Amino acid sequence: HHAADYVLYKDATKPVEDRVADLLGRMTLAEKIGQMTQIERLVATPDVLRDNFIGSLLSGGGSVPRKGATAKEWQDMVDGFQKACMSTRLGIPMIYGIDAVHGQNNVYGATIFPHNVGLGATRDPYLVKRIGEATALEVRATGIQYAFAPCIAVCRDPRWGRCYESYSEDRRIVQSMTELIPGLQGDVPKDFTSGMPFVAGKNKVAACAKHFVGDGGTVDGINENNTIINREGLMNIHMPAYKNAMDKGVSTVMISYSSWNGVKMHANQDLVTGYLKDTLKFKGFVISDWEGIDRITTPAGSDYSYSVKASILAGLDMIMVPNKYQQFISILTGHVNGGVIPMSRIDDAVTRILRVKFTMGLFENPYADPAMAEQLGKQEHRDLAREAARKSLVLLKNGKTSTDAPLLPLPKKAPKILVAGSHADNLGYQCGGWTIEYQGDTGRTTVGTTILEAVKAAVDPSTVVVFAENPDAEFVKSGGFSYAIVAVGEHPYTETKGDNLNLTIPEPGLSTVQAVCGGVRCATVLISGRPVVVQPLLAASDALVAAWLPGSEGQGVTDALFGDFGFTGRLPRTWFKSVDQLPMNVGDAHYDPLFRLGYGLTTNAT
Ligand SMILES: CO[C@@H]1O[C@H](CS[C@@H]2O[C@H](CO)[C@@H](O)[C@H](O)[C@H]2O)[C@@H](O)[C@H](O)[C@H]1O
Numbered sequence: 155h156h157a158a159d160y161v162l163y164k165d166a167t168k169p170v171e172d173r174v175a176d177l178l179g180r181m182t183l184a185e186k187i188g189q190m191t192q193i194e195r196l197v198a199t200p201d202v203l204r205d206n207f208i209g210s211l212l213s214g215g216g217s218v219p220r221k222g223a224t225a226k227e228w229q230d231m232v233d234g235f236q237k238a239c240m241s242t243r244l245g246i247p248m249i250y251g252i253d254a255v256h257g258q259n260n261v262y263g264a265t266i267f268p269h270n271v272g273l274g275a276t277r278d279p280y281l282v283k284r285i286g287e288a289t290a291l292e293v294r295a296t297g298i299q300y301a302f303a304p305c306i307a308v309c310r311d312p313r314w315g316r317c318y319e320s321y322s323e324d325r326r327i328v329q330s331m332t333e334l335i336p337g338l339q340g341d342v343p344k345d346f347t348s349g350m351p352f353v354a355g356k357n358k359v360a361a362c363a364k365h366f367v368g369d370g371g372t373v374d375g376i377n378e379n380n381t382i383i384n385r386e387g388l389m390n391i392h393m394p395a396y397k398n399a400m401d402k403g404v405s406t407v408m409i410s411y412s413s414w415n416g417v418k419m420h421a422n423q424d425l426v427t428g429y430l431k432d433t434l435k436f437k438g439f440v441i442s443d444w445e446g447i448d449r450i451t452t453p454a455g456s457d458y459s460y461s462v463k464a465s466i467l468a469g470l471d472m473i474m475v476p477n478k479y480q481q482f483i484s485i486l487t488g489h490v491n492g493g494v495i496p497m498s499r500i501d502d503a504v505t506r507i508l509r510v511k512f513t514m515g516l517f518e519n520p521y522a523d524p525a526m527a528e529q530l531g532k533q534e535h536r537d538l539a540r541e542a543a544r545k546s547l548v549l550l551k552n553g554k555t556s557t558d559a560p561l562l563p564l565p566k567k568a569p570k571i572l573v574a575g576s577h578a579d580n581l582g583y584q585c586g587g588w589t590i591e592y593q594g595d596t597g598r599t600t601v602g603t604t605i606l607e608a609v610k611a612a613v614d615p616s617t618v619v620v621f622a623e624n625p626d627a628e629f630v631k632s633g634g635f636s637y638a639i640v641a642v643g644e645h646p647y648t649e650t651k652g653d654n655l656n657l658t659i660p661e662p663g664l665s666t667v668q669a670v671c672g673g674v675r676c677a678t679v680l681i682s683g684r685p686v687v688v689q690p691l692l693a694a695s696d697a698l699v700a701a702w703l704p705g706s707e708g709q710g711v712t713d714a715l716f717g718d719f720g721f722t723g724r725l726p727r728t729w730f731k732s733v734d735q736l737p738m739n740v741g742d743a744h745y746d747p748l749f750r751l752g753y754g755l756t757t758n759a760t
């Protein structure tokens with residue numbers, strides 16, 4: 155279609171499938187294996203990217219150009235890598251991926267939304283869609299085109315260190331929250347075929363349904379571990395939301411470290427090829443988890459030749475290496491040259507990778523848009539995060555007896571009030587894991603509003619606000635306080651490291667609640683990624699709120715505490731009486747919850 159030097163794959167007016175086929179037909183084996191290779195920015199240079207025809211880069215958790223980097227620094231980094239990829243013979247742009255799992259959370263100054271468990275508490279799929287839309291803008295503000303989200307794990311045991319990344323133990327709620335996908339990617343057209351990938355263009359991002367499949371079912375919540383359950387339970391609990399993801403055009407699917415009945419997912423041809431590709435008709439690309447293929451063997455990495463063979467024959471398309479790219483490429487090249495992996499498998503993987511890249515407009519807009527930089531931390535997005543945080547709050551108690559005056563909502567005008575606890579003025583703790591660092595961090599790690607700052611911003615100007623992190627009983631009784639707000643809970647974790655199977659919050663937490671509540675009426679705000687042992691906190695408190703991990707916008711908490719809005723959140727998970735009961739799920743047999751799934755007290759706006 156028209157100039158003597160015309161190349162069909164470079165023609166933006168041509169159908170995606172025609173462009174894929176035209177490009178594929180021109181590629182060398184090295185070019186094909188390159189597309190299947192995703193590497194860490196930490197190991198990338200221009201020469202590496204050109205010489206190995208690299209298909210993708212990522213930032214893993216905490217992988218950033220520097221601490222405090224601006225949106226433009228991120229754009230310049232991504233564009234620098236892209237320039238190298240565009241300089242190859244065929245000029246195939248790379249796709250850059252990142253865990254933007256509650257906002258663009260590795261980035262300083264990005265809006266941090268509540269984690270998934272709290273979003274589950276909202277029962278508001280349209281809210282989650284809007285969060286997807288805002289997140290895509292903040293990811294594109296940094297030049298990145300691909301988010302490793304949503305996590306559609308159905309966490310069946312809160313001992314799992316990633317339980318906060320699951321919307322619910324109830325697959326129906328997880329299914330409902332797949333609305334994140336068309337938020338991130340754009341709504342699919344009216345005549346859309348389920349399983350086809352979709353991204354609307356340069357203001358949206360490719361999404362990733364993860365981690366396929368049964369990551370939320372690992373025995374004792376182990377992680378990296380074994381999901382022991384028959385096909386009926388896999389198909390009834392863990393699989394359904396993958397079908398909703400297909401219907402919404404999710405562009406990619408990431409495979410789980412976990413096993414299903416002792417078969418590693420990264421080596422499971424029946425599920426990856428037989429089910430996801432051949433039954434669900436998924437036509438996007440399947441990506442490994444981080445050194446996921448290495449972990450097929452015991453010990454991990456002990457037979458990388460086997461890892462490559464097993465994963466690629468199972469049907470994975472792109473490998474998150476992410477560091478030892480030379481070894482990966484060499485081994486895969488050897489397997490193809492030896493006939494161990496047929497060219498048909500390589501061509502399928504590359505077809506899928508290219509399909510996503512062409513579909514999403516990456517060949518037309520390979521570079522960042524500087525005008526998008528100002529989307530990062532944009533106040534409208536913070537207002538949305540604040541709405542989400544407020545909707546996520548579950549009121550568990552509002553009065554010690556049925557005849558007490560309800561403590562919440564609190565009056566904004568009072569002579570003197572106390573704000574206390576380890577979590578009252580700690581932005582990192584209120585964001586939890588996957589914020590700035592992989593495992594999160596403590597203190598003022600980004601731009602946000604702590605609970606204490608929210609309180610000071612909400613109250614009447616005549617209200618004196620006193621902060622004490624861990625006041626003793628005497629301090630409270632002598633202070634002349636009208637009431638106290640005390641915030642405690644879990645520290646940030648991902649159970650790569652965090653950990654504690656006992657699910658009790660660290661001290662001082664309970665001791666502070668007891669000292670405070672013993673002296674003045676108190677509203678306890680519990681910051682957690684999951685249900686934790688709560689009877690002693692309840693016993694001490696007049697009112698108690700499960701605030702989950704509400705993110706950067708602490709005013710969502712105070713919007714409910716002071717009655718600007720009523721409490722509406724409902725538990726998206728069972729609250730156990732003790733950890734001895736676990737696993738214990740709405741439906742079991744020994745189902746004896748402290749609070750059932752769906753529980754939540756309400757208030758009316760004042
Ligand atoms: C401890 O090593 C660190 O692990 C994390 C998480 S592993 C894996 O990472 C993927 C890419 O970031 C995530 O999409 C996926 O959900 C995770 O299971 C990794 O992010 C760090 O890069 C790595 O240092």
Ligand SMILES: *[C@@H]1O[C@H](CO)[C@@H](O)[C@H](O)[C@H]1NC(C)=O
Pocket residue numbers: 757758
């Ligand atoms: C809240 O709203 C409903 C009626 O709309 C009712 O349960 C309750 O009496 C109202 N007010 C308060 C303070 O609970």
